[PDB]
Copies of this chain bind each other. A is one copy, B any other.
Amino acid sequence: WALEDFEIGRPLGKGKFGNVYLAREKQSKFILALKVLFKAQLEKAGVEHQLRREVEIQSHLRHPNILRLYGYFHDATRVYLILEYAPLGTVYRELQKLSKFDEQRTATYITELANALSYCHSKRVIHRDIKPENLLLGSAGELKIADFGWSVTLCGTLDYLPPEMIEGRMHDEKVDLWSLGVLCYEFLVGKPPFEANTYQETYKRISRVEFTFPDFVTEGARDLISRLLKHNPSQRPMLREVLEHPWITANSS
């Protein structure tokens, strides 16, 4: 794989880490997206190890609701990621356009997200927080997790370590349950549940789990969102509980 194998189109975002472009593989004429990351930028920020781990994880993820990584390559200064192109843009842009989503559209997206996350959980892969600007849309309107936000000793010290230092990240697998609650609310309401005018007030609202619903949010949607937005991570439902929630099964396409 080399840069010359691709015809480049319009930019699809610019950042300090990498630029993304629409591209076409020259031989096949297959449309895709090419992300170019600069090695020195990744090294200077101490994110190069984190990137390699996320790319290795992402290589084995094949799901309709996860943005596909077709392959990758590099040269002396840059790493190139060959990605699926999602033609309908972000869920964030769609929410801006529509103001808020109806219950069918929302339950469908939540199902797609929980399916992707359940598929990853079965491979012992968990995801961190999820933002709607990192959720892309395919030609048939399928949502695509596109952030790559995945995660999978000193001598003579084991004897002295407590269980929490050796058992690993205990309930880090529950961060994405809280993200589904925030997204389900944001999709129905048009804004995230803890949004406030200042950092301190936003922090207070999340830490105390202080949120209310507009009157139009229905009983089923409130029940699901209230179960997802638990302060204690272990009390948040399993993804299989989300997929079988009656508001989800009634409204999801």
Contact = CB atoms under 8 A, between A and B. Distances in A.
Contacts of A156: 131, 133
Interface of A: 46, 129-131, 133, 156-167, 171, 174-175, 178-179, 182, 192, 194-195, 199, 202-203, 206-207, 209, 231, 233
A143 to B, nearest CB: 16
Given A165-B175, A175-B165, A129 B203 contact: no
A157 B132 CA distance: 11
Contacts of A157: 129, 131
A192 B159 contact: yes
Contact of A162 (B160, B161, B165, B178): B178
A207 B156 CA distance: 17
B158 A164 contact: no
Contacts of A158: 199, 202-203, 206
Given A165-B129, A165-B175, A175-B165, A182 B206 contact: no
Contacts of A167: 207
A160 B192 contact: yes
A231 B163 contact: yes
Nearest to A172: B164
Contacts of A192: 159-160
A129 B207 contact: no
A202 B156 CA distance: 12
A175 B195 contact: no
Contact of A207 (B166, B203, B207): B166
Contacts of A179: 160, 162
A162 B206 contact: yes
Most chain B beta-carbon contacts within 10 A, residue among A159, A167, A175, A182? A159
A195 B157 CA distance: 11
A160 B203 contact: no
A128 to B, nearest CB: 8
18 contacts: A130-B160, A131-B160, A133-B156, A158-B199, A158-B203, A159-B195, A160-B192, A161-B206, A162-B174, A162-B175, A162-B179, A162-B206, A162-B233, A163-B178, A164-B175, A166-B206, A166-B207, A167-B207
